[PDB]
Amino acid sequence: MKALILVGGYGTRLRPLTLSTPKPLVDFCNKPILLHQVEALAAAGVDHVILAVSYMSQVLEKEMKAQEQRLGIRISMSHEEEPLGTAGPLALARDLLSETADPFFVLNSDVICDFPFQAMVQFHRHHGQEGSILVTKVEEPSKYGVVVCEADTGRIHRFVEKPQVFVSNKINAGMYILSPAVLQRIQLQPTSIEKEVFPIMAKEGQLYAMELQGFWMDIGQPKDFLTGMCLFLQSLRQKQPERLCSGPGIVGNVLVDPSARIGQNCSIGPNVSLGPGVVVEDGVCIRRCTVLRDARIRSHSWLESCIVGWRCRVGQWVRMENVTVLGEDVIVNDELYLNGASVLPHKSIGESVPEPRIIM
Amino acid sequence: MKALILVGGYGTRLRPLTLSTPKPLVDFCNKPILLHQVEALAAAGVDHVILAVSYMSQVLEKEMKAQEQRLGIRISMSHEEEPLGTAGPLALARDLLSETADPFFVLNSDVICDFPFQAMVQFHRHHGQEGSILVTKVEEPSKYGVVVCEADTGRIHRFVEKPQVFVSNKINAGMYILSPAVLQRIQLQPTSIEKEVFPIMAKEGQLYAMELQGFWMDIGQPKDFLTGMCLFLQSLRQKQPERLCSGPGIVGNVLVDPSARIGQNCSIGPNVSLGPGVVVEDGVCIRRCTVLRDARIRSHSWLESCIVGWRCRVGQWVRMENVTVLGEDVIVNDELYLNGASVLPHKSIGESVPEPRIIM
Numbered sequence: 001m002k003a004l005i006l007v008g009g010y011g012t013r014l015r016p017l018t019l020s021t022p023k024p025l026v027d028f029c030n031k032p033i034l035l036h037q038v039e040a041l042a043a044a045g046v047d048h049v050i051l052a053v054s055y056m057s058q059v060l061e062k063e064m065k066a067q068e069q070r071l072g073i074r075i076s077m078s079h080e081e082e083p084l085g086t087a088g089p090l091a092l093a094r095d096l097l098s099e100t101a102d103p104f105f106v107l108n109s110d111v112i113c114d115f116p117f118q119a120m121v122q123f124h125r126h127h128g129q130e131g132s133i134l135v136t137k138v139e140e141p142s143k144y145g146v147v148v149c150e151a152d153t154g155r156i157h158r159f160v161e162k163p164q165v166f167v168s169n170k171i172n173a174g175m176y177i178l179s180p181a182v183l184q185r186i187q188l189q190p191t192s193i194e195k196e197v198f199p200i201m202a203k204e205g206q207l208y209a210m211e212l213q214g215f216w217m218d219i220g221q222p223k224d225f226l227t228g229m230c231l232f233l234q235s236l237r238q239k240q241p242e243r244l245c246s247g248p249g250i251v252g253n254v255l256v257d258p259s260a261r262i263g264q265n266c267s268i269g270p271n272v273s274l275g276p277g278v279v280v281e282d283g284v285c286i287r288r289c290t291v292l293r294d295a296r297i298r299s300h301s302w303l304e305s306c307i308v309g310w311r312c313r314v315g316q317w318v319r320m321e322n323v324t325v326l327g328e329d330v331i332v333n334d335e336l337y338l339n340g341a342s343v344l345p346h347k348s349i350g351e352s353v354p355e356p357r358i359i360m
Numbered sequence: 361m362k363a364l365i366l367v368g369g370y371g372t373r374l375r376p377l378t379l380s381t382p383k384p385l386v387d388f389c390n391k392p393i394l395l396h397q398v399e400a401l402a403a404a405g406v407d408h409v410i411l412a413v414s415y416m417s418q419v420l421e422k423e424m425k426a427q428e429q430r431l432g433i434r435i436s437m438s439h440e441e442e443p444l445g446t447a448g449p450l451a452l453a454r455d456l457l458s459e460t461a462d463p464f465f466v467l468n469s470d471v472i473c474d475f476p477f478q479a480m481v482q483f484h485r486h487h488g489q490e491g492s493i494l495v496t497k498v499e500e501p502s503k504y505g506v507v508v509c510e511a512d513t514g515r516i517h518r519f520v521e522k523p524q525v526f527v528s529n530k531i532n533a534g535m536y537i538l539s540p541a542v543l544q545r546i547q548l549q550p551t552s553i554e555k556e557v558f559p560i561m562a563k564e565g566q567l568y569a570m571e572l573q574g575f576w577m578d579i580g581q582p583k584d585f586l587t588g589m590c591l592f593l594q595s596l597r598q599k600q601p602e603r604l605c606s607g608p609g610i611v612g613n614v615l616v617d618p619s620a621r622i623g624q625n626c627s628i629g630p631n632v633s634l635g636p637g638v639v640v641e642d643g644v645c646i647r648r649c650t651v652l653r654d655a656r657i658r659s660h661s662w663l664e665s666c667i668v669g670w671r672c673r674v675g676q677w678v679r680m681e682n683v684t685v686l687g688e689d690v691i692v693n694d695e696l697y698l699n700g701a702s703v704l705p706h707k708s709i710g711e712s713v714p715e716p717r718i719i720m
């Protein structure tokens with residue numbers, strides 16, 4: 001089959017990371033998140049995948065040209081000269097997806113999940129109407145689309161309202177299957193796929209809901225990046241324990257790259273993704289973190305629940321907490337305390353930041 | 361001579377330490393505040409000194425009758441059953457200071473100086489008046505009893521405890537030479553030596569001032585305690601340089617007891633004094649701190665401008681800054697941040713203290 005991934009949206013949440021590297025190329029547990037999605041639907045059964053790019057096209061082109069030989073399936077690219085919103089990917093590549101009269105996958109690159117291509121296409125061949133949505137049960141995650149649905153019929157009869165969610169407590173999961181009739185029902189005007197035109201399809205009775213099995217997160221925000229990282233690590237523990245690194249100086253679930261080395265007397269705590277070539281000196285407690293590629297953490301430093309970017313150097317006796325995110329190649333001077341700091345790339349922090357504050 | 365040290369009682373400023381060990385007995389740079397006074401009195405040529413106790417005379421008097429035979433001067437004691445303040449024990453010891461027609465030292469128990477007893481008494485007999493006090497220059501004279509000192513002789517023109525209008529700049533250094541005729545003047549009823557005795561003294565022209573050389577501080581507060589140990593280690597750098605332990609990984613002036621040990625890869629930063637019997641683990645950075653007797657600081661901690669009392673166990677990856685005083689036998693758990701924490705005796709801390717608070 002075929003698959004469309006919307007991969008050019010500027011990533012304005014998750015900003016100190018996406019100011020350098022695009023949003024799906026951001027390393028998510030020693031892999032870009034787009035590589036997770038295209039590997040899942042490489043092994044699933046769509047043999048030709050389109051991804052539509054409007055933002056930093058050249059390095060996405062770099063790793064996509066290096067990647068479609070590496071998968072075996074085709075990586076076609078819907079390039080544009082102007083951002084066409086959430087739905088314009090369907091309209092610019094309308095000439096390529098309409099050639100077959102079969103439905104297709106519309107994927108979103110911020111989602112991390114366990115993907116049901118299987119149950120997606122069997123459920124979509126069951127329900128007989130046009131549109132099919134994944135939907136996940138939530139408590140606070142409402143920012144998404146509220147869906148009012150019944151039982152197994154799953155025919156959506158009422159739709160999206162963002163706040164004060166008294167009717168549903170389950171929301172959208174950013175992964176749909178759509179037939180070609182909607183694919184040429186909508187303009188090439190810049191518009192959203194889930195605000196303007198999905199409401200028409202919920203009014204029309206085309207829209208169905210499939211409840212996802214568990215482990216859903218979207219990593220649009222860095223807090224949600226870290227929670228999705230912990231969720232991905234405990235769902236990686238059950239399936240294959242063979243990949244999680246073990247040790248006396250480690251705790252729980254950790255994902256260290258083979259390039260990355262850990263110094264002795266370290267207590268690498270639970271839920272830590274250490275990227276390629278990262279260097280941890282002697283006596284570093286790191287919990288709930290994700291250190292990305294080639295970043296150095298010096299000795300006697302404490303790190304909890306914080307994202308270290310690409311090639312950042314963190315000094316000695318540094319304490320980082322409250323989801324502090326460092327951008328690309330940031331230097332933290334010695335004996336400082338960062339609580340809440342979002343540091344834009346190529347900065348050299350000289351004083352301790354004890355409260356959440358963007359440092360640019 | 362005779363020497364009268366009014367030793368305070370209840371030690372409310374500098375409270376977490378004095379809740380276990382009285383203020384004359386808390387070790388300031390590895391020996392107690394009274395011990396600096398009485399070794400300088402034994403070097404001064406004072407024949408026997410008397411200290412005017414009112415609170416916790418068990419441990420205090422047992423220490424004085426220990427070192428009475430070590431200094432070689434009779435460390436006599438004025439017990440009180442209720443506190444008489446600052447001019448009451450002048451009148452309780454009326455007979456025990458009225459026996460000789462010789463002047464006597466009246467010393468605050470909390471001032472730490474580079475005392476000039478010879479200068480003070482042999483400045484005193486040059487004018488022979490009823491009282492000759494020590495004065496020092498300071499930047500905020502509204503906290504301390506100011507004087508008006510004239511040119512080349514030093515008659516106290518006026519004396520007010522809190523000026524509030526800015527009369528002048530010199531202040532009470534907390535050391536006096538009093539003549540026995542001022543003894544019988546005031547009564548046993550408790551009052552202040554500064555409000556009434558000295559302000560009627562200055563009306564006559566019997567109070568005098570001797571300008572100090574420098575390095576005056578009264579250690580009432582823990583902030584004044586740490587500023588005073590900074591200045592005392594400076595005086596040791598000027599005068600007796602071998603007393604300070606400097607080595608390879610030592611930064612600045614450090615005064616270590618011989619019984620105290622320090623691990624490798626640690627940085628014992630400037631103006632630090634380690635008391636007796638402490639044990640310092642590997643990977644710490646201790647700057648501007650005092651660590652009192654037998655306390656433990658575990659690995660990879662960062663301590664700055666803090667007081668760690670007797671038998672405390674500061675855990676691993678622990679940050680402490682901003683005049684955080686620990687009382688006797690306080691256990692800090694692993695990876696906690698204490699900014700400003702005054703911690704009551706026999707407490708176990710299990711949460712971070714992000715703002716200056718009292719923990720009880």
Ligand SMILES: Nc1nc2c(ncn2[C@@H]2O[C@H](COP(=O)(O)OP(=O)(O)OP(=O)(O)O)[C@@H](O)[C@H]2O)c(=O)[nH]1
Nearest residue numbers: 006007008009011012013052053054083084085109
């Ligand atoms: N090619 C392209 N992709 C887009 C465009 N707008 C949104 N997308 C993609 O749509 C997917 C989901 O959109 P969003 O969740 O709103 O993410 P976003 O566009 O990065 O915006 P923010 O979350 O506000 O930072 C993301 O993978 C985006 O890359 C666009 O104009 N062109």
Ligand SMILES: Nc1nc2c(ncn2[C@@H]2O[C@H](COP(=O)(O)OP(=O)(O)OP(=O)(O)O)[C@@H](O)[C@H]2O)c(=O)[nH]1
Nearest residue numbers: 366367368371372373412413414443444445468469
């Ligand atoms: N013997 C004795 N000396 C006292 C007593 N009260 C005050 N003093 C002395 O009076 C002088 C001024 O007192 P402070 O500077 O306030 O020190 P403190 O008595 O410890 O009291 P705080 O620091 O305010 O809690 C100091 O030298 C004390 O030593 C007392 O009740 N008995």
